[PDB]
Design a protein around this ligand. Structure first.
Ligand SMILES: COc1cc2c(cc1Cn1ccnc1)Cc1c-2n[nH]c1-c1ccc(C#N)cc1
Length: 260
């Protein structure tokens, strides 16, 4: 008895849909995160039911109590990756490499089952009790591969400082290079504690400086040559020339043994 009863003990986050609360089981004391949402929710639930990976936030189930949708998801006691990034500093390079390895494992998993996240950012990257990175929030996610047939995307979504330039310049684009680009912006943020530009467009001076290879400027001047050589391959404007994840796994810094 009472094993199905949950107590809402604290607010974890706030969003456009509603709120995220820490729920504790009355009998077992198990902790879960409950997403309270007042077509978009139906797709999020269907995508979440497909997921089963150690670097993806677990989905336990859903319950509709009237007009309110309750999504039962993994509680990650380490919090957001965002709070591990010290403004204008970043974090120790070995910590950033380990989180980047875990982020790649998660993204490889999603792309392998034909899912694109479309909003990778440190706010959506959570940490469990052992600081294992978990990809979260599949509210903007979509199926880009079905019956081994790829479909090109055209919808404008994500967060401007993390979006790939093809999203702003092209009518249609491949899904996988978009997620790779956002992972490169996350890596920049982890190693420099700042985002390189407001958006990836010619009108943006910081973006033009990068295309002109002015790496003597911030945030690039704070980043060591080995991770910076990887960022030069990820943050490539043409998505067809941008490095793919199998080639990121062969990168020199990606395979560099690091210890604080
Ligand atoms: C342990 O600290 C946290 C833990 C967690 C979050 C924020 C904090 C940070 N925090 C602590 C108190 N208020 C905010 C958000 C979250 C946490 N665990 N799980 C989730 C979460 C899970 C799924 C989704 C979705 N979609 C959104 C959030």
């Amino acid at each position: 008895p009472f094993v199905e009863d949950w107590d809402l003990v604290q607010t974890l986050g706030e969003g456009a849909a509603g709120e995220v609360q820490l729920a504790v089981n009355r009998v077992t004391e198990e902790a879960v995160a409950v997403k309270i949402v007042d077509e978009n929710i139906k797709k999020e639930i269907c995508i979440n039911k497909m997921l089963n990976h150690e670097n993806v936030v677990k989905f336990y189930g859903h319950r509709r109590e009237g007009n309110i949708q309750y999504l039962f998801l993994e509680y990650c006691s380490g919090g957001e990756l965002f709070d591990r990034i010290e403004p204008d500093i970043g974090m120790p390079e070995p910590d950033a490499q380990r989180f980047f390895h875990q982020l790649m494992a998660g993204v490889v998993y999603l792309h392998g089952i034909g899912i694109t996240h479309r909003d990778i950012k440190p706010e959506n990257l959570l940490l469990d009790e052992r600081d294992n990175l978990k990809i979260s929030d599949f509210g903007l996610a979509t199926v880009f591969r079905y019956n081994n047939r790829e479909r090109l995307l055209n919808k404008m979504c994500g967060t401007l400082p993390y979006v790939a330039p093809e999203l702003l310049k092209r009518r249609e684009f491949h899904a996988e290079p978009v997620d790779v680009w956002s992972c490169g912006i996350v890596l920049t943020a982890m190693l420099a504690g700042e985002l390189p530009w407001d958006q990836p467009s010619d009108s943006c001076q910081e973006y033009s400086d990068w295309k002109e290879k002015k790496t003597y400027l911030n945030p690039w001047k704070k980043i060591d040559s080995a991770p910076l050589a990887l960022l030069h391959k990820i943050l490539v404007e043409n998505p067809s020339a941008r490095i793919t994840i199998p080639d990121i796994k062969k990168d020199r810094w990606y395979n560099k043994p690091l210890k604080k």
